[PDB]
Curated annotation (Swiss-Prot):
ATP 1 binds at residues 385-392. Expressed in small intestine. Expressed in liver, kidney and brain. This is ATP-dependent translocase ABCB1. The lineage of its organism: Eukaryota, Metazoa, Chordata, Craniata, Vertebrata. The chain crosses the membrane at residues 16-38, 75-95, 145-166, 174-194, 251-274, 289-310, 610-630, 655-675, 731-751, 753-772, 833-855, 872-893. ATP 2 binds at residues 968-975.
Length: 1170
């Protein structure tokens, strides 16, 4: 973060080869940059040879104009040969040196990250650390890459040009030197603008991007509450600012380039005026004036080309400071370490004694105050207590995830503090609540625990757990491919295979932490069976929720208020009547779009396009005008006239130069203004329409795997801003290229056809040379960050779940995987360095060889009296310099192909029409609904995978005032029925009624606004508390009285009153931290403001504590009252407070009856409640 680090300390991983590369690259760069200010020295003397003979011929009316020009053809070929070799060395060597140093840094930085222990990752954000690995290293690479050689080349050009200017003629050099600072400043500004191109500016758009992300991620709730119009309004309000910022950016860029060109042409005019004054006197010659002026001007404008390199180097140092800080940091308990104490046969005897512990982030407070245990081999320890006493702190402390501030922990006599770190974490097997799985196969995940394991032990471990049927029935058996972070598998299966993975390690001291994790009922029972199967000959500390499995335990340690007080088995705790007994009583592809359609999108802004095309014509018509004026101004001295006529003509031509500069600035500003405004308006309109279309489309469209939230926001952020490049930029590029190149070719053919025909063969190569130079100066080949995606995925999945990784003792494994994934792109970059170097060198050298070829043929033609020197200059400066300008213009513009590809998607999504339209005004909104929801033989299938049906003709019938309960396995039709009753999807078959009226003819907006729902998981908006609670009945301004009475009804109007600012806190962020109980209560409060006639809930309490669950449950029970409320919950939570129970079996209903019938009969419901 600090750029104040020594220059040479940056080059710390420099081998001998890298240092030799740097020195030879620097020498080659100094050589290469001395060519252009030297070609204007040969070009000056060549002009004198042509001009001197021209005076002699005119006086006589071309003897040695063909012999002398032979020598100067060699000089151009020599300078071109040097640039052919020097430029190859400069670009390739510096890129090779940087490509090698960064490879060491990238591997070494990942070595430091894995070395750091838990606690370092608490202070250092995992997201920020992941960002530094992928972006800061790239910043370093850009800083120490080709830009250093570019800086050396620019400085060499500056010094060589000024030396040549002073040596040839000092009088003219001083005049340009006086105005040199402003030229250098303008060049530096233009270079910084050019380098800061091709990177998307999302700082302005982030405001709207946050809203888009939150809406699209939570599209279910937005559709449920019918707030889509409000979200669209908010999105437009946010979009306006980004539109303004984009307009300003475009205007600034065009102003900068226009100022650069204006200064160039003004310098031309002043220098030529003073040069004519000198030449008429006789101090100088036309060739000497050309040499001095061109050399000094190139030198002055080249000192600004090195400006981006200095800033890049400073930023590289600043970004490398933190990376080097992490590298040289030594953890105290690092897993690597160096050997350590290691017993042969550790029997296993845990020991806690005076354990005082505090979390490093908040060490001012303490959680542990003297925990002490005496569990020996073969026993079992259980922990019971309230939420907040620190029942997982000891779990993390046992396997040396931290260090106790006071006291000691011992195992088998010896203290843990003197023990080999790898051995300890190897003998300590652990499981947690979340069964995190890696992207590799199930068998590969199993092998991840211990590498040197064959298939036989994996089979044994799977047999021990419960997977030898679940994975065998699945395709691909053991090697089943885990995809999309374990999308196929569900929670219980992941937990079972995580138990198997823990079994694979064959540990000696097991350690379970909240393994239950409320995995419904059957999954929970199976997990408990697997857990008890696992615990046979192992010292375990079993922390369990619901406090039912803790009954059977050798020592049920009572974790209450730090130091454990309650102790003993169930009978002793029952006699003592402590926290254990109390809580026990408590519990018991797309075809391309034609250019015409894309053009029609921005048709409403036609005047902008008209003015822009006119300005593009006037702007592109400037290079041939410059060629004509240059040829005329040199021909003024070529011919024999009287001095006064020469002076007057030269002054006229200088004024023409100044007028050209003024026109260039004006047209650049106007073209930028018009085209930028048109593009920004088009982008805003496209984003608005795409967002509206996305909101209108049904849930099935979002459920499609291609249409993910990330993909949709990427479309809305990138493609809707790239579409503008297929109309305005395309028109400007084509118009400018035509109006310069065609005009130059036509003018050249009129004045000379032989030389034009010869020069028409190098035009493609010169244009490609300009394109290559412009695509290297802007770093377009360096902003790319592809071919490292696999390594980035490995790094992310190893740094995000670093706790599981460090508990699994796998650092060398991930290090080697990262190195292997980095190996191939290293060699690819090494080859691409040479490829790019040779391409740049050849393309640059063609520009130097063109002089020799063109002027040799021109010498022949002039000798044989077929044209004049002025015509040769006109043809050259119109066919070659025009080609350079064509190549440069065609590169400083967005790519046309990607623009049309994005426009295809934009046009596809804009015109899309849904099935369940959410904007259909047609409807039959009645007076009052009695909430009679019935289902008849309804068969439904998911749209993404219409292969196995979910519903098999359900039959359902509910009257007003009756509370219906439905129970079944997890993932069954209950959630799908909830979705379908709200008309989220379309049933394939069956009928849905509502007070005798079919659901087809009911208005969608009326239905979704006529009832309220509570989501299975708590979903919250980042708006204020007042807005988040007023996000219920929309299209109506609500008062605070309704809000407060709903909060009172929801049993939440205590915590809100116990908060600063009351009903104004920024909910979902800052320090609100509602946990889960308060989130559920505020969600049901938001659902209660609408006063729905029918209320739907689905597993509100899923993974809450043993205290906040009761408050939410009683709030739900109170909220029902006289409403047609459907309820899905965890078994006895609300199943017995209802009236009728519905049983689901493979989607279709199984039995229908009251509680007494189902309980008395030996049915499935009795089976799962026995
Ligand atoms: O390609 C080399 C070598 O070019 C030649 C070699 C040999 C003979 C030649 N004969 C005639 C013309 C070029 C010749 C020169 N580039 C030409 C292109 N510069 C670009 C550039 C881009 C767009 C508009 C104007 C400019 C000009 C300088 C500049 C300043 C800062 C950042 C970038 C640049 C500027 F703003 F003033 C870099 C140097
Ligand atoms: O092709 C033109 C015009 O380019 C464009 C025209 C219109 C629109 C454009 N839009 C985007 C990019 C380029 C555009 C640019 N060359 C390249 C830049 N000059 C090079 C050059 C090289 C290094 C440093 C400074 C310069 C500048 C002039 C100069 C004088 C004598 C010999 C060569 C040159 C100078 F010493 F003062 C020639 C014109
Ligand atoms: C630790 C070992 C480091 C070895 C370095 C040797 C190569 C050396 C280049 C040293 C100079 C090369 C020859 C210069 C000849 C000058 C006439 C590289 C210097 C890099 C400096 C980068 C400059 C970037 C802009 C800085 C602006 C203040
Ligand atoms: C894919 C195909 C894309 C085709 C795009 C064609 C665009 C054209 C636009 C031309 C507009 C008028 C300019 C013509 C040249 C005028 C020259 C005046 C001296
Ligand atoms: C990406 C594609 C960019 C294409 C840019 C160039 C276009 C075509 C330009 C053609 C220039 C000369 C046309 C023919 C002139 C003939 C005069 C007698
Ligand atoms: N990442 C963390 N950084 C700092 N303090 C934390 C962090 N996680 C938890 N704590 C604090 O550590 C203390 C003990 O946490 P505790 O073990 O009770 O966590 P838990 O997730 O509720 O688990 P358990 O229910 O098993 O006890 C609490 O005061 C808690 O706020």
């Amino acid at each position: 973060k600090k750029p104040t680090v020594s220059v040479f300390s940056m080059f710390r991983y420099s081998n001998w080869l890298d240092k030799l590369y740097m020195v030879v690259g620097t020498l080659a760069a100094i050589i290469h940059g001395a060519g252009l200010p030297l070609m204007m020295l040969v070009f000056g003397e060549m002009t004198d040879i042509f001009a001197n003979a021209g005076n002699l011929e005119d006086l006589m009316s071309f003897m040695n104009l063909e012999e002398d020009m032979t020598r100067y053809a060699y000089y151009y070929s020599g300078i071109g040969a040097g640039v052919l070799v020097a430029a190859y060395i400069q670009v390739s060597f510096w890129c090779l040196a940087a490509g090698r140093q960064i490879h060491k840094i990238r591997k070494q930085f990942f070595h430091a990250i894995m070395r750091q222990e838990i606690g370092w990752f608490d202070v250092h954000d995992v997201g920020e650390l992941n960002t530094r690995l992928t972006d800061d290293v790239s910043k370093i690479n850009e800083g120490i890459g080709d830009k250093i050689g570019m800086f050396f080349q620019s400085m060499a050009t500056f010094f060589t040009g000024f030396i040549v200017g002073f040596t040839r003629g000092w009088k003219l050099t001083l005049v340009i030197l006086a105005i040199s600072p402003v030229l250098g400043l303008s060049a530096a500004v233009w270079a910084k603008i050019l380098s800061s191109f091709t990177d998307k500016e999302l700082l302005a758009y982030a405001k709207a991007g946050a809203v888009a992300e939150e809406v699209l991620a939570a599209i279910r709730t937005v559709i449920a509450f019918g707030g889509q119009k409000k979200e669209l309004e908010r999105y437009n309000k946010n979009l306006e600012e980004a539109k303004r910022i984009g307009i300003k950016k475009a205007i600034t860029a065009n102003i900068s380039i226009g100022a650069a060109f204006l200064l160039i042409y003004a310098s031309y005019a002043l220098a030529f005026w003073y040069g004519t004054t000198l030449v008429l006197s006789g101090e100088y010659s036309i060739g000497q004036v050309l040499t001095v002026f061109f050399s000094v001007l190139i030198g002055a404008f080249s000192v600004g080309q090195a400006s981006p390199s200095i800033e890049a180097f400073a930023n590289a140092r600043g970004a490398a400071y933190e990376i080097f800080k992490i590298i040289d940091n030594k953890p105290s308990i690092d897993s690597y370490s160096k050997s350590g104490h290691k017993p042969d046969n550790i029997k296993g005897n845990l020991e806690f004694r005076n354990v005082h512990f505090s979390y490093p982030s908040r060490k001012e407070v303490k959680i542990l105050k003297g925990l002490n245990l005496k569990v020996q081999s073969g026993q079992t320890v259980a922990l019971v207590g309230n939420s907040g006493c620190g029942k997982s702190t000891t779990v993390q402390l046992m396997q040396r995830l931290y260090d106790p501030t006071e006291g000691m922990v011992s195992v088998d006599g010896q203290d843990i503090r003197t023990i080999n770190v790898r051995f300890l974490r190897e003998i300590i097997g652990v499981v947690s609540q979340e069964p995190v799985l890696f992207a590799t196969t199930i068998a590969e995940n199993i092998r991840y625990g211990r590498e040197n394991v064959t298939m036989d032990e994996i089979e044994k471990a799977v047999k021990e757990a419960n997977a030898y049927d679940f994975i065998m029935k699945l395709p691909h058996k053991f090697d089943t491919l885990v995809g999309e972070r374990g999308a196929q598998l569900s929670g219980g299966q992941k937990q079972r295979i995580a138990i198997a993975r823990a079994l694979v390690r064959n540990p000696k001291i097991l350690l379970l932490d909240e393994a239950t994790s409320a995995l419904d009922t059957e999954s929970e029972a199976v997990v408990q069976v697997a857990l008890d199967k696992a615990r046979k000959g192992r010292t375990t500390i079993v922390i369990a929720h619901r406090l039912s499995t803790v009954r059977n335990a050798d020592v049920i340690a009572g974790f209450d208020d730090g130091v454990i007080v309650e102790k003993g088995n169930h009978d002793e705790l029952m006699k003592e009547k402590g926290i254990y007994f109390k809580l026990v009583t408590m519990q018991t592809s797309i075809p391309p779009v034609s250019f015409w359609r894309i053009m029609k999108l921005n048709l409403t802004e036609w005047p902008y396009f008209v003015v822009g095309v006119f300005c593009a014509i006037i702007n592109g018509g400037l290079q041939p005008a410059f060629a004509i004026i240059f040829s005329k101004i040199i021909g003024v001295f070529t011919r024999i006239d009287d001095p006064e006529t020469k002076r007057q003509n030269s002054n006229l031509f200088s004024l023409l130069f100044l007028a050209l500069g003024i026109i260039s600035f004006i047209t650049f500003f106007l073209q930028g203004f018009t085209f930028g405004k048109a593009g920004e308006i088009l982008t805003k309109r496209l984003r608005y329409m795409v967002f509206r279309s996305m909101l209108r489309q049904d849930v099935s469209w979002f459920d499609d795997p291609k249409n993910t939230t990330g993909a949709l926001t990427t479309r809305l952020a990138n493609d809707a801003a790239q579409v503008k490049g297929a109309i305005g930029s395309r028109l400007a590029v084509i118009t400018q290229n035509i109006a310069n190149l065609g005009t130059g070719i036509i003018i050249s053919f009129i004045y000379g056809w032989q030389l034009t025909l010869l020069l028409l063969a190098i035009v493609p190569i010169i244009a490609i040379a300009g394109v290559v130079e412009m695509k290297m100066l802007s770093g377009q080949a360096l902003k790319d960050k592809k071919e490292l995606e696999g390594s980035g995925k490995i790094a992310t999945e190893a740094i995000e779940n670093f706790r599981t990784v460090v508990s699994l003792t796998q650092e060398q494994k991930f290090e080697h995987m990262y190195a292997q994934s980095l190996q191939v792109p290293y060699r690819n970059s090494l080859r691409k360095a040479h490829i790019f170097g040779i391409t740049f060198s050849f393309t640059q050298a063609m520009m130097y060889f063109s002089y020799a070829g063109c002027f040799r043929f021109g010498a022949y033609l002039v000798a044989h009296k077929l044209m004049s020197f002025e015509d040769v200059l006109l043809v050259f400066s119109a066919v070659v310099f025009g080609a350079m300008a064509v190549g440069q213009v065609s590169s400083f513009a967005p790519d046309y192909a990607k623009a049309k590809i994005s426009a295809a998607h934009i046009i596809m999504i804009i015109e899309k029409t849904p099935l369940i339209d959410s904007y259909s005004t047609e409807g039959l909104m009645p007076n009052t609904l009695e909430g009679n929801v019935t289902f008849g033989e309804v068969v439904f299938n998911y749209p993404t995978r219409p292969d196995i049906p979910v519903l098999q003709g359900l039959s359902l019938e509910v009257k007003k005032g009756q509370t219906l309960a439905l129970v079944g396995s997890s993932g069954c039709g209950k959630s799908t029925v909830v979705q379908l009753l709200e008309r989220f999807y379309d049933p394939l078959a069956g009928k849905v009624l509502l007070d005798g009226k079919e659901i087809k003819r009911l208005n969608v907006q009326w239905l979704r606004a006529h009832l309220g729902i509570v989501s299975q998981e708590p979903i919250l908006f980042d708006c204020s508390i007042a807005e988040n609670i007023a996000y219920g009945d929309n299209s109506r301004v609500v008062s605070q009285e309704e809000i407060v009475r709903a909060a009172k009804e929801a049993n939440i109007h205590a915590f809100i009153e116990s908060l600063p600012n009351k009903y104004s806190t920024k909910v979902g962020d800052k320090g609100t931290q509602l946990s889960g109980g308060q989130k559920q209560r505020i969600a049901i409060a938001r659902a209660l403001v609408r006063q729905p006639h029918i209320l739907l809930l689905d597993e509100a309490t899923s993974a809450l504590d043993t205290e906040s669950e009761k408050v939410v449950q009683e709030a739900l029970d109170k909220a029902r009252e006289g409403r047609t409320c459907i309820v899905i919950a965890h078994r006895l939570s609300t199943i017995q407070n209802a009236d009728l129970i519905v049983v689901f079996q493979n989607g279709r209903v199984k039995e229908h009856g009251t509680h007494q019938q189902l309980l008395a009969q030996k049915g499935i419901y009795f089976s799962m409640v026995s």
